[PDB]
Short mmCIF file of C-alpha atoms and ligand atoms in Angstrom, two decimals:
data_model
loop_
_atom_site.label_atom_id
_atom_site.label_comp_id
_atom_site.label_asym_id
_atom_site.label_seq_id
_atom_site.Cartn_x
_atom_site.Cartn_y
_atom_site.Cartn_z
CA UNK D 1 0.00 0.00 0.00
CA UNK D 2 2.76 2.61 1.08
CA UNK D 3 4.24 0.98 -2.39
CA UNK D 4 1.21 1.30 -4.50
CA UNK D 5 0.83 4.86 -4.05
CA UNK D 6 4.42 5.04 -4.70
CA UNK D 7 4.50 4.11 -7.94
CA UNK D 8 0.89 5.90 -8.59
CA UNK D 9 2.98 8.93 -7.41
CA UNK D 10 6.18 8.23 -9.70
CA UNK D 11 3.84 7.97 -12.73
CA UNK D 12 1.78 10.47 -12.24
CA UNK D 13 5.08 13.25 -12.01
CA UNK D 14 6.80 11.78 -15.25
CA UNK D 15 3.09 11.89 -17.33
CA UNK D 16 2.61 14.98 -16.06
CA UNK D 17 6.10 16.49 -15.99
CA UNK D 18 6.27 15.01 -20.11
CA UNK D 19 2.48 15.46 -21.51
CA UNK D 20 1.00 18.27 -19.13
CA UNK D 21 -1.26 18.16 -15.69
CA UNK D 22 -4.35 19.10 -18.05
CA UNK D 23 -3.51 16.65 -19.97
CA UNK D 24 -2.98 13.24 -17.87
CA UNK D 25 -6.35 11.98 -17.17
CA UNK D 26 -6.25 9.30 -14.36
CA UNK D 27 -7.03 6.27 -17.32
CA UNK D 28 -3.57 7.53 -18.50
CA UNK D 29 -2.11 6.92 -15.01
CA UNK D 30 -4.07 3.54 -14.71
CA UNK D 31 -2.77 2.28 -18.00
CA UNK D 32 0.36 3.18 -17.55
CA UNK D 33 0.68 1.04 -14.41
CA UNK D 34 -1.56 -1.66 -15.05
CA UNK D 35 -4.57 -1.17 -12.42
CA UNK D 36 -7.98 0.20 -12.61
CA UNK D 37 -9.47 3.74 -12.17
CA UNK D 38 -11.12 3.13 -9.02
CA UNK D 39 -7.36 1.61 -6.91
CA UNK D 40 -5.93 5.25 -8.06
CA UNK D 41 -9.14 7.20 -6.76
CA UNK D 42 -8.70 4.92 -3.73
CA UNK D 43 -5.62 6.63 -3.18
CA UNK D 44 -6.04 9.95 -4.24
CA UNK D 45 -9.93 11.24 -4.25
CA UNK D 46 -9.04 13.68 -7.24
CA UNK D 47 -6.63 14.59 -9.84
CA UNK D 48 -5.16 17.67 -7.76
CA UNK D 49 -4.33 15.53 -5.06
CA UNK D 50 -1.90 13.36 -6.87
CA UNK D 51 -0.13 16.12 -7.79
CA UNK D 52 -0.49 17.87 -5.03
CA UNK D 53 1.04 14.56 -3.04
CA UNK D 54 3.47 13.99 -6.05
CA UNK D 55 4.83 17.61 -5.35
CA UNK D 56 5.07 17.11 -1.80
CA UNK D 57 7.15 13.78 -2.71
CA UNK D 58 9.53 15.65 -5.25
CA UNK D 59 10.50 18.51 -2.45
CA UNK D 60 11.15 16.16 -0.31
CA UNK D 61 13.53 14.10 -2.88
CA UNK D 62 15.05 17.21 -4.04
CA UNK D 63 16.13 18.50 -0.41
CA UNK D 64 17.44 15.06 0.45
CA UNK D 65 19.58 15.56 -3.07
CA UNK D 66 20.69 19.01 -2.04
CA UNK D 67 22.03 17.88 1.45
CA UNK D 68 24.09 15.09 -0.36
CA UNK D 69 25.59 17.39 -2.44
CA UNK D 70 26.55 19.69 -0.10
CA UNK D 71 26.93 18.03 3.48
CA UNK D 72 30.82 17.63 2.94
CA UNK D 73 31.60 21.37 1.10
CA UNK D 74 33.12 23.81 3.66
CA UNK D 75 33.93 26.17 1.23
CA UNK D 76 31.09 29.07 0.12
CA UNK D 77 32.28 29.76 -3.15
CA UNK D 78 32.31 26.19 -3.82
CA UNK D 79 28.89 25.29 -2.30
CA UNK D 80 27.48 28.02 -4.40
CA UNK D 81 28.12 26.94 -7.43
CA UNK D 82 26.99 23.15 -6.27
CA UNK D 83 23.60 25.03 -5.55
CA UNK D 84 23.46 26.74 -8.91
CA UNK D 85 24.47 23.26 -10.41
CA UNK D 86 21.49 21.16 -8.89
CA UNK D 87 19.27 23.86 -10.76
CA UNK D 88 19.67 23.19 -14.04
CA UNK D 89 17.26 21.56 -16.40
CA UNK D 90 19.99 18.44 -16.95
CA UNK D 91 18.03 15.74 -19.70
CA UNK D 92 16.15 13.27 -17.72
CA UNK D 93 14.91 13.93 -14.03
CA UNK D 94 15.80 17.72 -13.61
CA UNK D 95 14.29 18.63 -16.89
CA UNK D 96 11.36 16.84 -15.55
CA UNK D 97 11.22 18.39 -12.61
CA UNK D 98 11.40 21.88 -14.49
CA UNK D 99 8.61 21.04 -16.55
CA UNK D 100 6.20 20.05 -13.64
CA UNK D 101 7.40 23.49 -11.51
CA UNK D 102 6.62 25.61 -14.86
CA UNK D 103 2.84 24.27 -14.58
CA UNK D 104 2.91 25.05 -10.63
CA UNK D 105 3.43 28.25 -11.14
CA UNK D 106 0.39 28.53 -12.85
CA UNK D 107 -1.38 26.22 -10.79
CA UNK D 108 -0.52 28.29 -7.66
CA UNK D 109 -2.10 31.63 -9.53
CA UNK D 110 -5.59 29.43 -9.09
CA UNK D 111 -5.19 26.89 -6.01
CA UNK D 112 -3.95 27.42 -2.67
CA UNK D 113 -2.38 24.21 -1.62
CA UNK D 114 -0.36 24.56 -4.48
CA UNK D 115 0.25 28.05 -3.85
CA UNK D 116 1.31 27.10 -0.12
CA UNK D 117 3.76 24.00 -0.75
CA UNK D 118 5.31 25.82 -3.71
CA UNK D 119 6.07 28.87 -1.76
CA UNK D 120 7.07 27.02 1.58
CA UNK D 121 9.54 25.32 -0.47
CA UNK D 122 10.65 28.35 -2.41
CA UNK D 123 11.48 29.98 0.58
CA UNK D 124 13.06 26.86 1.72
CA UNK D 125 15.63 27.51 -1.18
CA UNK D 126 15.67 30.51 -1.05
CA UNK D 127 16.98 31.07 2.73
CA UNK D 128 19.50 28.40 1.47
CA UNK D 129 20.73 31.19 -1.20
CA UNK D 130 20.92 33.90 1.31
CA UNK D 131 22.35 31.64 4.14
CA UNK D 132 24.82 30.65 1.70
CA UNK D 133 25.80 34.02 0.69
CA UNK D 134 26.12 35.73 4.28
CA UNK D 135 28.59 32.88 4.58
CA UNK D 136 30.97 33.48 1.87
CA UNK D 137 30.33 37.22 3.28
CA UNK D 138 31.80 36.38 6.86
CA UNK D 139 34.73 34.03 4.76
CA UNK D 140 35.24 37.25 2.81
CA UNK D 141 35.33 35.94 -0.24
CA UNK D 142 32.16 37.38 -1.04
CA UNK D 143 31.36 41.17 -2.02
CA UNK D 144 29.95 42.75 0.95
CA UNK D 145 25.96 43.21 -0.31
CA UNK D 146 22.61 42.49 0.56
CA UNK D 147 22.44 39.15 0.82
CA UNK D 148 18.51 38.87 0.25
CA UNK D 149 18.41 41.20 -2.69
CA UNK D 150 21.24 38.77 -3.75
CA UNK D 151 19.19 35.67 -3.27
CA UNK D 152 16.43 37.90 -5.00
CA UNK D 153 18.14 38.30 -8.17
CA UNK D 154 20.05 35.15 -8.51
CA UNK D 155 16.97 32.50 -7.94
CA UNK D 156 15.14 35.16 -10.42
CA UNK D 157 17.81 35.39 -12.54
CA UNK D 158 17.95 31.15 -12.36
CA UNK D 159 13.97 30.59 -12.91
CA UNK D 160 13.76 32.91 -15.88
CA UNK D 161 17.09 31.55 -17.61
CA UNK D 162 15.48 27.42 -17.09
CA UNK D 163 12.27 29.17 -19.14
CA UNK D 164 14.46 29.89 -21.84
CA UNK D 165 16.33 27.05 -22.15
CA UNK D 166 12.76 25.30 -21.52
CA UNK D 167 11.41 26.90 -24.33
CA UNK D 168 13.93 26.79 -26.46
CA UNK D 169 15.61 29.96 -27.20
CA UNK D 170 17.66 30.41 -29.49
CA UNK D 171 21.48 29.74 -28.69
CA UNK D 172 20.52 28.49 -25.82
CA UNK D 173 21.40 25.60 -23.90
CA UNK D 174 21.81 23.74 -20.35
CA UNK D 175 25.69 24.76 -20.38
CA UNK D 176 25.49 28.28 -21.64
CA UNK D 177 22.44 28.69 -18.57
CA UNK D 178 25.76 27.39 -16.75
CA UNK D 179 27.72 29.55 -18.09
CA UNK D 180 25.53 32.47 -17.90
CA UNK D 181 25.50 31.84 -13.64
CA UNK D 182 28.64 30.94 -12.91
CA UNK D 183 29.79 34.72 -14.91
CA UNK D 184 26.65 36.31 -12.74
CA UNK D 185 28.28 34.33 -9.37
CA UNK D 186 32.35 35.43 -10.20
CA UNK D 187 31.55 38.73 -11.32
CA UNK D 188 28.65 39.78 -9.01
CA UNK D 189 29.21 37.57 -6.19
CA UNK D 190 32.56 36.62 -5.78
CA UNK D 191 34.87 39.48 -4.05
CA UNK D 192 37.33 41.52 -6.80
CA UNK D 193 40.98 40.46 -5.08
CA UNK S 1 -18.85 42.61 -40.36
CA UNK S 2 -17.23 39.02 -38.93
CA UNK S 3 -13.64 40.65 -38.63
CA UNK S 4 -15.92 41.73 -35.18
CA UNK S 5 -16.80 38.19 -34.25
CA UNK S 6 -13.35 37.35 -34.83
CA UNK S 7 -12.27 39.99 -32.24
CA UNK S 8 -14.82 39.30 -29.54
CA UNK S 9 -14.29 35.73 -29.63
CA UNK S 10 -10.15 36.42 -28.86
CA UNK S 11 -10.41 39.47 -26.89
CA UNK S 12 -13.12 37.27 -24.52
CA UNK S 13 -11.10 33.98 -24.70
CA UNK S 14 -7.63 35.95 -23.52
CA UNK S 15 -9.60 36.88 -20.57
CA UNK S 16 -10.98 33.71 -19.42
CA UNK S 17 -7.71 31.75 -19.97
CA UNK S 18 -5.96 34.72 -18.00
CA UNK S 19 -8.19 34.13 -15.02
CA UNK S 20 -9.45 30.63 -15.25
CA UNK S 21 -6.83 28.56 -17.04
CA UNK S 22 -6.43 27.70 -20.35
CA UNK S 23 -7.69 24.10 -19.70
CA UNK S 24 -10.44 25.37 -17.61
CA UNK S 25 -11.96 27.50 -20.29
CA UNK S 26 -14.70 25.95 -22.09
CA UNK S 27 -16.37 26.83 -25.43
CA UNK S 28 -19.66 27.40 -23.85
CA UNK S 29 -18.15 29.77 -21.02
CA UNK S 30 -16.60 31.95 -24.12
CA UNK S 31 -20.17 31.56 -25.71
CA UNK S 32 -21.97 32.18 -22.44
CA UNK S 33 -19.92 35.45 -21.90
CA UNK S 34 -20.51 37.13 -25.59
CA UNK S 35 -24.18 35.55 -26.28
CA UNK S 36 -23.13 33.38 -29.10
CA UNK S 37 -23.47 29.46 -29.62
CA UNK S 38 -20.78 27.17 -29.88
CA UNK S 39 -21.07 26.49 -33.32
CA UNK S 40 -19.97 30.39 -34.15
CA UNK S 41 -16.64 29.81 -32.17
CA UNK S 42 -15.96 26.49 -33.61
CA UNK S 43 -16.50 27.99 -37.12
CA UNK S 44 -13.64 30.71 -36.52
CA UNK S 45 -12.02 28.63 -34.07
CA UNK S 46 -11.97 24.73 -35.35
CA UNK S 47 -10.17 24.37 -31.59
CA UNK S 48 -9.23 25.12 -28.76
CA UNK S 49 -5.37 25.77 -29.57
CA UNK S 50 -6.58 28.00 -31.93
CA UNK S 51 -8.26 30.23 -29.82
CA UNK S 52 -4.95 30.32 -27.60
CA UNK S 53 -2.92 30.62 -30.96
CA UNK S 54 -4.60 33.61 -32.44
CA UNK S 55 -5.53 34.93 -29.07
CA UNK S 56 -1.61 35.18 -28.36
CA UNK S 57 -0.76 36.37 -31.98
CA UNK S 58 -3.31 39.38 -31.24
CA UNK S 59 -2.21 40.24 -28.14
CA UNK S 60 1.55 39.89 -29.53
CA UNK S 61 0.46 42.67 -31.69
CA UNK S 62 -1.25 44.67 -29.19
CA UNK S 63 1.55 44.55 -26.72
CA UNK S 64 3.94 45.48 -29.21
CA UNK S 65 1.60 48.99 -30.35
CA UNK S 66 1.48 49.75 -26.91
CA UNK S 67 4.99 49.41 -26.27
CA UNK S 68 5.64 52.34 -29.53
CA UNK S 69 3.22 54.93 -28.09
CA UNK S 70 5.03 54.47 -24.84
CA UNK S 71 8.18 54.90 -26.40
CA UNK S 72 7.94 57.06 -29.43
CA UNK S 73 9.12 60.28 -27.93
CA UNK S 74 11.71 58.83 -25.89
CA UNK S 75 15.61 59.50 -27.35
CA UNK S 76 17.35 59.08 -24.17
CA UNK S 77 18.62 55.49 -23.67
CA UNK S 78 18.12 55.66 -19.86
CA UNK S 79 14.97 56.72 -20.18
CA UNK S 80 13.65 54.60 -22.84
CA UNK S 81 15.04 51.08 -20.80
CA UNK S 82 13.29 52.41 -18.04
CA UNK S 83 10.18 52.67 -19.86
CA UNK S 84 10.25 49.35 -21.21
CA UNK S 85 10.73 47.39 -18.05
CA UNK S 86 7.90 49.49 -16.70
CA UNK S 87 5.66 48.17 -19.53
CA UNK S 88 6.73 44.67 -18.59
CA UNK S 89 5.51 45.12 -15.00
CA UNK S 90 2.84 43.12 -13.61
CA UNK S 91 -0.05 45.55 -12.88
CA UNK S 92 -3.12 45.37 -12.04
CA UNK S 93 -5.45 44.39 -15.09
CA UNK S 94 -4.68 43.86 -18.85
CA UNK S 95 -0.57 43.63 -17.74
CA UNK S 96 -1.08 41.34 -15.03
CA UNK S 97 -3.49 39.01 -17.49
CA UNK S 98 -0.81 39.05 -20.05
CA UNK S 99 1.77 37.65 -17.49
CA UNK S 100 -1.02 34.73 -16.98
CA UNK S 101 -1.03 33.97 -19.96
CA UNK S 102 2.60 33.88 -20.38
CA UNK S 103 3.14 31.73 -17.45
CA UNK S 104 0.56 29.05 -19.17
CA UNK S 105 2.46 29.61 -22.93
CA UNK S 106 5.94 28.60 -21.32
CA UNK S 107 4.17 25.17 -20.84
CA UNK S 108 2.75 24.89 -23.52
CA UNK S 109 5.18 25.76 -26.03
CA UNK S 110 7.01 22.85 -24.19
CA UNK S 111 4.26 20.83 -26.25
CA UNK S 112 3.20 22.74 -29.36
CA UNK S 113 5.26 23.58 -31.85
CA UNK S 114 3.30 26.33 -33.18
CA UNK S 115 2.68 28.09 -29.58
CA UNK S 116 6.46 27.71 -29.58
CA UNK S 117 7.39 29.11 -32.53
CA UNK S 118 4.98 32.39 -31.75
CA UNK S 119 6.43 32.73 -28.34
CA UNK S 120 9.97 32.47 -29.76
CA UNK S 121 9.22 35.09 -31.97
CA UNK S 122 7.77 37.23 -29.52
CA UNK S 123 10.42 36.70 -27.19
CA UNK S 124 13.10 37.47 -29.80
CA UNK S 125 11.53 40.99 -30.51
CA UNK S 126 11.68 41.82 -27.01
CA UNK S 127 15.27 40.74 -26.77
CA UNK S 128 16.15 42.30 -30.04
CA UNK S 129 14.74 46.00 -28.68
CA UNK S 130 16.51 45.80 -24.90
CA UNK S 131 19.67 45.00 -26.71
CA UNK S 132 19.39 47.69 -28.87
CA UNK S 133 18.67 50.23 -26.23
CA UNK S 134 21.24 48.98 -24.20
CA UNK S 135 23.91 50.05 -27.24
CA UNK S 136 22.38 53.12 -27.96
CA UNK S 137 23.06 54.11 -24.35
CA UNK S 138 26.33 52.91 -24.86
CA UNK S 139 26.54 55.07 -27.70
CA UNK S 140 25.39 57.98 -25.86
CA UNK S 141 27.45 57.34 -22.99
CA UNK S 142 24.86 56.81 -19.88
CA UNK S 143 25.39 52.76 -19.76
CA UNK S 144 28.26 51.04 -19.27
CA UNK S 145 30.14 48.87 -22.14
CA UNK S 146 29.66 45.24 -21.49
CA UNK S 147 27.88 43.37 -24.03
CA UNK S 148 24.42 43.96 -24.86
CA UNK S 149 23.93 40.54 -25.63
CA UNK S 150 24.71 39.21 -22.49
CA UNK S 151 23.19 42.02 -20.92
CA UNK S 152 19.92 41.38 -22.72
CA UNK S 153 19.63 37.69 -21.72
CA UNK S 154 20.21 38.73 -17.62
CA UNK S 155 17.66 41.64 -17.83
CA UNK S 156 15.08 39.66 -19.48
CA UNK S 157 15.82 36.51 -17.69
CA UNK S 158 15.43 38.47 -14.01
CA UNK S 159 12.29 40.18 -15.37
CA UNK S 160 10.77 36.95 -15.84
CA UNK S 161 11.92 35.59 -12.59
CA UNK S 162 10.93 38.22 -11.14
CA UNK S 163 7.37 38.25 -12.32
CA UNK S 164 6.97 34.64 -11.21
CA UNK S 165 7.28 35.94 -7.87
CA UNK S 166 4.89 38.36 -8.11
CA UNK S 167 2.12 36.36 -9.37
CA UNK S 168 3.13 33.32 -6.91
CA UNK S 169 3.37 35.32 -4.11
CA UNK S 170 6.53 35.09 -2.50
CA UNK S 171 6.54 36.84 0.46
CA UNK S 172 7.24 40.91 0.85
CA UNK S 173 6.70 40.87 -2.82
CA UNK S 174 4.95 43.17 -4.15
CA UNK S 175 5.13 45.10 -8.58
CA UNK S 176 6.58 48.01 -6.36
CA UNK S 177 9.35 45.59 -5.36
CA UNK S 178 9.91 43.88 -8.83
CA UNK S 179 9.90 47.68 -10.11
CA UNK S 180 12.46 48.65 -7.26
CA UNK S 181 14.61 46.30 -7.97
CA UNK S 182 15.04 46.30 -11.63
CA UNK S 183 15.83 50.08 -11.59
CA UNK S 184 18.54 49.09 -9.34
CA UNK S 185 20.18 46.67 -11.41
CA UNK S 186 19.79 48.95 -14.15
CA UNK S 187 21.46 51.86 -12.27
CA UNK S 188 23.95 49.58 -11.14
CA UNK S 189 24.46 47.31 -13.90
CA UNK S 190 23.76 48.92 -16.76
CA UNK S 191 24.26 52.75 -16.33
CA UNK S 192 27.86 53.84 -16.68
CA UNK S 193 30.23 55.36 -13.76
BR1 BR E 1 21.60 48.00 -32.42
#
């Protein structure tokens, strides 16, 4: 049961992440996983709540990622650019991911769970930016600066470069997004010495 | 005439998906809302991606007329970039249902080709006329030589990152915010020393 809904869950994020939330009916997530209609409304009375579960899920898996990555770096410079590196829209699971966050942020114009998970775990990250930054501040190898207008414009600057490579802009690409915030981090961020 | 119809139909339909959802309009909620039948719609309209195709294509248009009476009498390059990210603000009513719609076309383009294509365009434009403002100020001496391209991908990238957390509602946001804080990266970024 605690397995059932698991891979109800899993399903349901890559169908949605790859055809769109509008556009997954729960047949879609039934056929794709071999039982009926009426197990997956057993689980989850209505479409919104298997996303809204499959998000809760996902922030959870993403966190856990981001405290791998960075439980052993001491150094703020370096753990910065780990951050900026989990971010980007890599083929496969993170370009997933981006995809089903796009349609949240529409979803969160209209519905207030949504709204409330996806900003609890925006700030989440966010606090992680600006925590990061005061600390490369105190190392001093960090411009002295705002450290929340910092976070600001660096997770905005992030979200609206992963819409372009998203949508396919032209020259663009997961490693010139890469490019284009590691430049933003050395030449913004990092201290001139 | 039926150039009217036409009009109505699109100028109704960009409404309703702004506030409702693309996949939450209906035919008969369009219909409902100008007195017409379904069969009218479907006659200019064979679907829905139409609607959302020529809806967007109008308001492409529109966007772009407003943008040249804002601008028109404008020669000074500070001025003018100020202007523009102004018009790209958030506010309250036909701005702020743009944005909407926006947020819903990024997904969607990750699905249609032709929604793609159109918001490429669109997108292009826009990029096209920052970078070209930002070298006529560089010409004129009030902003900084760096390049424009560059320069134009981080403006318009923040601006978009930005608006996300307007609409989502991140916390002490607020379009006086957004607007506070581009005209600091412009007058710290862009405008020279
Ligand atoms: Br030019």
């Amino acid at each position: 049961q605690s397995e059932a809904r698991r891979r109800i869950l899993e399903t349901a994020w890559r169908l949605i992440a790859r055809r769109g939330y509008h556009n997954v009916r729960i047949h879609d997530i039934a056929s794709e996983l071999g039982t009926s209609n009426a197990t997956i409304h057993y689980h989850f009375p209505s479409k919104k709540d298997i996303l809204l579960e499959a998000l809760r899920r996902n922030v959870k898996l993403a966190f856990d990622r981001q405290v791998a990555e960075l439980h052993t770096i001491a150094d703020a410079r370096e753990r910065l650019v780990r951050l900026v590196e989990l971010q980007l829209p890599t083929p496969g699971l993170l370009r997933d991911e981006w995809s089903v966050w796009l349609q949240v942020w529409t979803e969160s114009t209209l519905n207030p769970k949504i709204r409330d998970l996806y900003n609890d775990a925006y700030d989440r990250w966010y606090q992680t930016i600006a925590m990061t930054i005061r600390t490369g501040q105190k190392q001093g190898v960090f411009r002295d600066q705002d450290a929340d207008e910092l976070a600001t414009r660096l997770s905005a600057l992030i979200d609206g470069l992963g819409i372009q490579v998203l949508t396919g802009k032209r020259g663009c690409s997961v490693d010139h997004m890469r490019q284009h915030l590691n430049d933003f981090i050395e030449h913004n961020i990092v201290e001139r010495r």
